[PDB]
Amino acid sequence: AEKPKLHYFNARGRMESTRWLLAAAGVEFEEKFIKSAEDLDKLRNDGYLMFQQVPMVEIDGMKLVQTRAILNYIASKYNLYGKDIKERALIDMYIEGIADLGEMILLLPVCPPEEKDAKLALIKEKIKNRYFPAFEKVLKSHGQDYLVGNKLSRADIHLVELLYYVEELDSSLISSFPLLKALKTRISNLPTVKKFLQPGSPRKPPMDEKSLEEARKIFRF
Amino acid sequence: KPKLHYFNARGRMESTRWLLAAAGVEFEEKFIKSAEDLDKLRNDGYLMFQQVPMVEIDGMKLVQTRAILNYIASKYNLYGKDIKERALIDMYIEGIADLGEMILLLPVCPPEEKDAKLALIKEKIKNRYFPAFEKVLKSHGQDYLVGNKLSRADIHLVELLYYVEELDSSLISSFPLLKALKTRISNLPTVKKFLQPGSPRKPPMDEKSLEEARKIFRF
Ligand SMILES: CCCCCCSC[C@H](NC(=O)CC[C@H]([NH3+])C(=O)O)C(=O)NCC(=O)O
Ligand SMILES: CCCCCCSC[C@H](NC(=O)CC[C@H]([NH3+])C(=O)O)C(=O)NCC(=O)O
């Protein structure tokens, strides 16, 4: 009946992984872009935001806030969350590691300049020594095209999204991880993901200084 | 019995202790006491991302707080009846997590920042989080946050109410429905037993325990 409506500002931020997941699922959606603090205050005043924050997604008659609530619902609805409780446990473990690394990268620009260089270095070492080894190992354990259940899940989508951001950081980091490289390609070639990667999709560019400034004005930080 | 791998402290394992206890599930704990203990877990292949919490349950070695909790909640029927009830539960408990994270990390803030960050936490409790949960309870008038049945949401929220009480017992005072929930949940036989002295419930982290954390986790 009604397309999901995504409420956020015009940036990756905390809404991009939802854009990826919906697109991967073949689900069309609309976006309503917040451009100012007054836009956000209006959502607040209208009663639309349980904790007075965005992301918020209107879907199936609900007003869902909190990134993980949104993604868990969409993943379940479009059978991207595994086939039983144990596969969901594997998915969750994998994607919370992805979330942890993703949060580090997300927040980097918001670091004090005297700290940013150490923090980036630390992110690169965790990538090389902690996270990419863990995911490579999963893929090597079973030899399958997907992380869990030998079928596409949200885990594959969330990890490939992150591989795109790590490439932006440093395209060398993935070089010693052939299986991750192969996953990136395979997933990128799925027709829904290929369309999402093409120009003109809702996929968002890296956040530049001006966008970061808009964020500070809109969310008041 | 599930086996919980963590240090002898609340930290990131306490919400799992609460949820297991609430569900009536007996568990065992293996306490890490040194960096060397953590290193053995890592070396033995027990930790996917070289971190704890880790829980051995039903043949899996599960890391990541949320993976552990989601598995336990589904297994013991504390995650609602369908994906829409799960959506409500998830939205509520991620709000709880956000607030919980601020309180958890308070002892680690630089000392020159701690005064400001406590005051911010009290402000958000008063003006953002407790209003939101009081609003949910008032909206339906039922004893439980979701589905008129006990769920993980009630348990995680009441755990947080105890920590907020530790911070400032006045913060809940204008929120009568949250007070009632706290009482009700605390009186359920499993939660009551967990709240009594000598249970696996952990105390507030003191300075000695925070020094142990730092040695163990090398920060
Ligand atoms: C470099 C900057 C990156 C910008 C990302 C910030 S997202 C906007 C922020 N929303 C949250 O922090 C939501 C956190 C919540 N845990 C979620 O995951 O949905 C907001 O509404 N803030 C308003 C408020 O909290 O009052
Ligand atoms: C106020 C004190 C806070 C208590 C310490 C934090 S918990 C121990 C820490 N584990 C994590 O940070 C796990 C985060 C993960 N997202 C989860 O929720 O499980 C660890 O293993 N760290 C070792 C490392 O990462 O190498």
UniProtKB/Swiss-Prot annotation, chain A:
Liver. GO terms for cellular component: cytosol; extracellular exosome. The isomerase activity is inhibited by S-methylglutathione (GSMe). The keyword Aminoacyl-tRNA synthetase does not apply. It catalyses: RX + glutathione = an S-substituted glutathione + a halide anion + H(+); prostaglandin A2 + glutathione = prostaglandin A2-S-(R)-glutathione; prostaglandin J2 + glutathione = prostaglandin J2-S-(R)-glutathione; (13S)-hydroperoxy-(9Z,11E)-octadecadienoate + 2 glutathione = (13S)-hydroxy-(9Z,11E)-octadecadienoate + glutathione disulfide + H2O. Its EC number is 2.5.1.18, 1.11.1.-, 5.3.3.-. The modification N6-succinyllysine is found at K3. CDD domains: GST_C_Alpha, GST_N_Alpha. Pfam families: GST_C, GST_N. Keywords: Acetylation, Cytoplasm, Isomerase, Lipid metabolism, Oxidoreductase, Peroxidase, Transferase. Residues 84-206 form the GST C-terminal domain. Changing A215H: Confers ability to hydrolyze S-glutathionyl benzoate to glutathione and benzoic acid. Optimum pH is 8.0 for the isomerization of androst-5-ene-3,17-dione. InterPro entries: Glutathione-S-Trfase_C-like, Glutathione-S-Trfase_C_sf, Glutathione_S-Trfase, Glutathione_S-Trfase_N, GST_alpha, GST_C, GST_superfamily, Thioredoxin-like_sf. Its main location: cytoplasm. One of its GO terms (molecular function) is glutathione transferase activity. It is found in: Cytoplasm. PANTHER family: GLUTATHIONE S-TRANSFERASE, GLUTATHIONE S-TRANSFERASE A1. The C-terminal domain may form a component of the hydrophobic substrate-binding site, but in contrast appears not to be directly involved in GSH binding and is not absolutely essential for catalytic activity. Glutathione S-transferase that catalyzes the nucleophilic attack of the sulfur atom of glutathione on the electrophilic groups of a wide range of exogenous and endogenous compounds. Involved in the formation of glutathione conjugates of both prostaglandin A2 (PGA2) and prostaglandin J2 (PGJ2). It also catalyzes the isomerization of D5-androstene-3,17-dione (AD) into D4-androstene-3,17-dione and may therefore play an important role in hormone biosynthesis. Homodimer or heterodimer of GSTA1 and GSTA2. This is Glutathione S-transferase A1. It comes from Homo sapiens. The lineage of its organism: Eukaryota, Metazoa, Chordata, Craniata, Vertebrata.
